[PDB]
Design a binder for this molecule. Sequence first.
Ligand code: NAD
Ligand code: NAD
Ligand code: NAD
Ligand code: NAD
Ligand code: ZN
Ligand code: ZN
Ligand code: ZN
Ligand code: ZN
Ligand code: ZN
Ligand code: ZN
Ligand code: ZN
Ligand code: ZN
Lengths: 336, 336, 336, 336, 10
Amino acid sequence: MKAAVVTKDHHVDVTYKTLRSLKHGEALLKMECCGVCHTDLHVKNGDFGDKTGVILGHEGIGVVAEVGPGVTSLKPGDRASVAWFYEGCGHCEYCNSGNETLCRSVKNAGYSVDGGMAEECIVVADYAVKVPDGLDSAAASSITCAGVTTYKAVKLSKIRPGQWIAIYGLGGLGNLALQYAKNVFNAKVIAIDVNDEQLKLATEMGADLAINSHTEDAAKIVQEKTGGAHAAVVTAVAKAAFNSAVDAVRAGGRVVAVGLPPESMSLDIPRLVLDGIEVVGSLVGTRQDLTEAFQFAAEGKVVPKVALRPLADINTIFTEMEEGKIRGRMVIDFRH
Amino acid sequence: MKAAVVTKDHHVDVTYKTLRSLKHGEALLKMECCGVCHTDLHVKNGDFGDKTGVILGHEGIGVVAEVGPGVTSLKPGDRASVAWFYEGCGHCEYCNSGNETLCRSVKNAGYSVDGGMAEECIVVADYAVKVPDGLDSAAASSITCAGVTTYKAVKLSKIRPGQWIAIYGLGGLGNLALQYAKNVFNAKVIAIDVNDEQLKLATEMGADLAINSHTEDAAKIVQEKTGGAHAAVVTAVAKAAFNSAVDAVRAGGRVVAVGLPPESMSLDIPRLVLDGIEVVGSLVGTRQDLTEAFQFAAEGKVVPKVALRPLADINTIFTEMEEGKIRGRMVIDFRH
Amino acid sequence: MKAAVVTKDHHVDVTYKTLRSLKHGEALLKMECCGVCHTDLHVKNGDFGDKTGVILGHEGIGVVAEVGPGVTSLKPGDRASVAWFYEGCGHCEYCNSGNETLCRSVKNAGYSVDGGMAEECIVVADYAVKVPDGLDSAAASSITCAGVTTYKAVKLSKIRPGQWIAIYGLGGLGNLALQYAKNVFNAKVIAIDVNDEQLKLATEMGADLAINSHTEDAAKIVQEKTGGAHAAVVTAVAKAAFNSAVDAVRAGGRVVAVGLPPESMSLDIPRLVLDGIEVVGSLVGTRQDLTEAFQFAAEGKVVPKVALRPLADINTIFTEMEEGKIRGRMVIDFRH
Amino acid sequence: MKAAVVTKDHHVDVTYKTLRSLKHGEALLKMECCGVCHTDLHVKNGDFGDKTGVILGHEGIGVVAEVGPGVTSLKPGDRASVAWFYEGCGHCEYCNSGNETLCRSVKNAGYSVDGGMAEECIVVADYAVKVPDGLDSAAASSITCAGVTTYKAVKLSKIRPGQWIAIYGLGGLGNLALQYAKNVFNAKVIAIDVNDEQLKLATEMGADLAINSHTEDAAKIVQEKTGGAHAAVVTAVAKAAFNSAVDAVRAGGRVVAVGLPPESMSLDIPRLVLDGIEVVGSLVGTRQDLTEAFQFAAEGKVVPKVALRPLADINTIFTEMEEGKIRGRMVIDFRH
Amino acid sequence: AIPNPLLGLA
Ligand SMILES: NC(=O)c1ccc[n+]([C@@H]2O[C@H](COP(=O)([O-])OP(=O)(O)OC[C@H]3O[C@@H](n4cnc5c(N)ncnc54)[C@H](O)[C@@H]3O)[C@@H](O)[C@H]2O)c1
Ligand SMILES: NC(=O)c1ccc[n+]([C@@H]2O[C@H](COP(=O)([O-])OP(=O)(O)OC[C@H]3O[C@@H](n4cnc5c(N)ncnc54)[C@H](O)[C@@H]3O)[C@@H](O)[C@H]2O)c1
Ligand SMILES: NC(=O)c1ccc[n+]([C@@H]2O[C@H](COP(=O)([O-])OP(=O)(O)OC[C@H]3O[C@@H](n4cnc5c(N)ncnc54)[C@H](O)[C@@H]3O)[C@@H](O)[C@H]2O)c1
Ligand SMILES: NC(=O)c1ccc[n+]([C@@H]2O[C@H](COP(=O)([O-])OP(=O)(O)OC[C@H]3O[C@@H](n4cnc5c(N)ncnc54)[C@H](O)[C@@H]3O)[C@@H](O)[C@H]2O)c1
Ligand SMILES: [Zn+2]
Ligand SMILES: [Zn+2]
Ligand SMILES: [Zn+2]
Ligand SMILES: [Zn+2]
Ligand SMILES: [Zn+2]
Ligand SMILES: [Zn+2]
Ligand SMILES: [Zn+2]
Ligand SMILES: [Zn+2]
């Protein structure tokens, strides 16, 4: 079957792959859709180590073709997902405390195990969360990483209704972060990006304020217009956004780091201490987070911006991603 | 009366002052003693703006000599304190939510209002927390800032009993943080400093592990020996400790920033995100935090290491502090 | 001036009153409006002990006519409120931890100090929360108890967006609880009452499900239709509603008690334990809660249903209240 | 092998059984010890419905004799436990959020699946938590329910160090609740029981105050001596203790219900609301809770009081339990 | 001022 495979020179080989038979607890999905995440870009670029040979993809939606021995959580015909959180150990300090994505034995689709950017994908059944009936597959692909991650990030931000949240980076994740923050958590939102087209879309979807941080001083403007944001979620792919977020929140405010540029942020210590700032990393979401995130999309509370592409376009898509030419998500369509 | 006043060239002049009359809600303290905090050093060096002319000190313990109009919270004869949190507004998003030290109209003793390093001090009665009867004045002075700050920091760290907490900087604050962490919160403690003599004190007081971060790679050792600390409290006066703390915690761990070096810390973004790290600033403690911190010292659960000095020694003390020669706290003794 | 005063036989005498002069920290309000709360009914009935002679009312909105000595938080011409939380001590374990309504020295308007159901009212200035410009006085009156209490109750329930909250008693409080839950916290709502008119209004205002507990088995219907509510807020004046709510939640669910019938509720102990149920009392809101609650009404996110009445109608109103004939709030109007 | 089987007239028949073969994911334990919990008494009495035929026991410690297909979490020779929480589904709103004991598909040893009060016991390997090497088996049996339950209950109480906690029922659970509260969470403890013998033991093990609730008004004494307990943990087997706890706590205080009498508690509604009381049920502990609870015992921070008995004594033991004649735990010993 | 640790305070 055809798969997106990472190459040694950091490109994608759209090539032939043959899957092994199933083990106990596994299921085989015939894939319908797989979103392209910027994490796929980091992976293929070698940012998290050399993963030449891995099949990419962890916004995968597929239909169960076969189940392996012992499988009761899925049956043939079910629509299920292939997310970054592909499998946790189920029995550790993280897994049993409601923090399973931090499992130190975690397997991650499109990184440490073959992902869903291929015609077929093997999943661990109890970890392939089902898609609810009212949600179309292309939209569901976006929720499978972009959506769940930002739903969870906003949850973790401690933002309360009527409060100001600054969203940095309005791409695949960021646009959905805006929608969750506004439509689900009832926050007021500042949308911040270096790309005017991303900002145009944000305003179109209800961002209360929009700032181009390349031409403007984003933190200063947030402070002037809102009194300082109560929280921030940083989904941008550059350290400057993280640095700006620290200065954009009011005292006691929480910055949630989500973006993964291979860089360091700088945090002024007297600012951190004397203003009681908080900075916290967030990592995708638990299976329950994903279930909840899907249901919001099923009920139309968030609407993923998606465009369908054939698998052959994957290298071109990554160029578009690099160049900031994507509104929302590009979604690989395997449907014949 | 005599007062420690900040000079234009970042020293202290012992100066005669005559205090103004009390206003409504105020009280006059005849001071018994005043601890020297490293914050006094930052203040006099101009790290927080020029405060030439200000009376230093916010580890003050005094006896109420006189009360102004309307005062019922204090009466003549009471022993009360002069802390960093000298007065909050009492009616704002911070003051009413249990976060009063973050009040944006806060007055800080020894910085934005005359402090307690003088023979007399005017306090706002409702904000001058009383000292419990079972606690000697010199010991109480340390709890007034070093103690309440580290009590609150450990509380905020969310360390649970049996868990590992790394304490960076074992000075005036750090030695008390160790005592609170071990004796009150029942944590296992790693003590970390660049000074072997501070570490010896930590070990004497039951630190489970001690590490010299100058001669050893502290984070590596913490990871190796404990699997990574569940939390950290950083009271050190150098950015390297804040940077190391981020690497010394396990995934999901919380670093509580307390020290105030005029520097920035650096946070590797993928580490922050992929390991769900949390970094939060802590700022002294509420009046209730101080009351609780005082009570622990009164019952002997913590025992401040103190040495008494005359007011005339203040510049010398700051030199000892700068040079890393102080152990525990130096306390200005005004007593007869 | 005229005031609604409690009589020994549990009625109201609209009586001649001349207020005393202002003390330090106090302000004189010329009243515009005062809501009638069911708590005023409990008070006059002696449910909280004999309070013969007190002026009722703690949904008061008035304009500052005069300020006493030392007052800077209010000035003449300001619109401010008279709430149940009329004054706290400002310096105790409750006041400094964000729990000020639980202050053991609290003064409560219309109960332990003269309230706002009168043409004039003395307030403690720092505790008389200002009314935002964009909010009419009658609507503001409702927020001053019914609104803030239910805003806080829903906040305390820990209901998350998309989750089911069962609201018992859709009266003055209950109708606003519905509006905050739906419009501010983004919850799905079950409205439960014994009065079809109250339920009809709830449905008009967006209640997802509506149950008359005199005609149906409320908890059973909740369980069947929703799987059990994630939380409950009980604003009913009958113990049966409290008992039912405990049955109507799912495992791990939280019941927030708000109503004040002078009765006891019953908890099945094995149900409470084996299903990890939580039951908690909520008491109005802090000054910050009220400020926030007001702002939601100012922005039209909730809209109090009100009817204006002369002070002469107070006894008639209480009869209407007893008989369950009020939709929303009756508001005493002092305006020309 | 010999098993304690529940009879139709609420006794135990020591019965010879041949266990079925292991299924996938299962292990066979050869039992060393099984503590007798008061839950076994409730179960055999029919308090939770007719369970005639079930093997009792969920304080079981055994050595793995055999593992079934696919088992990697345990191997022959391991010491593992049989607790109340015998198996959860692993993928639901409770299991994935850190609340796995509330799983609606839970299997409970000695209730809905054969327990560990037998010479052999079949377990689900991933849920049979391993016992640390430094902990003797008899001691470990008590931590397996009495210990983990009270460790978790005190954790859930939100008691902070130096605060007052009231423990009702100083039996098997209660004595360990005292030890965890005192030695682990650093609380001050009021021990409350109807049995002077239990109280003598509580005092011997460090209880700060002891009250006999039969001869004294417990709540009245708690209020007078401590100003009201910050929290309460009710491990008693009578409703009067649950009712008393509500009056024993200070405002804002939390009552944790743990005991399982087949009765109802009464909760005065004005008390609940105007004093902001919290009442919450706690149900054993998660696998991580048990792991932590075991470690405290392994390190000697708690020391279960145990007495070894042969399986033949089981009916006599239940009589002793009924009559309040057991100090700590009776432990069925299968060794030698 | 904003930010401006300590100095920015009212
Ligand atoms: N933490 C997690 O669990 C998680 C999950 C998914 C993705 N991620 C990471 O989130 C980041 C974004 O993912 P994506 O798929 O949304 O990428 P994307 O390419 O779709 O969007 C990136 C956005 O960042 C914006 N940006 C670039 N520089 C900026 C700056 N200085 N300030 C503000 N905005 C700026 C770009 O204009 C673009 O709109 C990636 O690093 C990805 O690896 C993390
Ligand atoms: N957040 C607050 O509310 C608050 C309150 C009081 C003090 N402070 C700040 O806390 C800091 C320390 O206060 P103090 O009175 O304890 O100072 P101190 O001089 O008594 O102790 C300083 C300690 O830091 C150690 N140190 C220096 N470099 C280090 C490094 N690289 N790694 C580890 N340790 C190192 C020194 O050896 C010394 O032991 C100061 O910046 C002070 O202003 C903050
Ligand atoms: N906790 C607080 O801080 C606080 C604040 C304000 C009011 N209260 C109390 O809240 C309660 C309600 O106040 P209100 O002003 O909204 O009263 P209200 O008279 O306006 O409304 C009472 C509602 O309870 C309904 N009801 C009666 N029996 C019921 C039952 N068995 N099940 C369901 N619903 C039932 C009535 O039909 C009515 O709709 C009173 O006890 C009041 O004292 C508490
Ligand atoms: N919630 C859970 O997860 C969980 C776990 C284990 C046990 N339990 C339950 O906890 C309860 C106790 O278990 P146990 O093994 O410790 O029983 P136990 O027999 O060892 O202890 C019972 C104690 O309750 C005391 N008591 C009786 N009436 C009292 C009263 N009115 N006031 C104060 N104390 C009183 C008795 O004197 C005795 O000391 C049982 O109901 C059991 O089912 C619950
Ligand atoms: Zn992704
Ligand atoms: Zn795990
Ligand atoms: Zn200080
Ligand atoms: Zn303030
Ligand atoms: Zn009211
Ligand atoms: Zn108070
Ligand atoms: Zn048990
Ligand atoms: Zn489950």
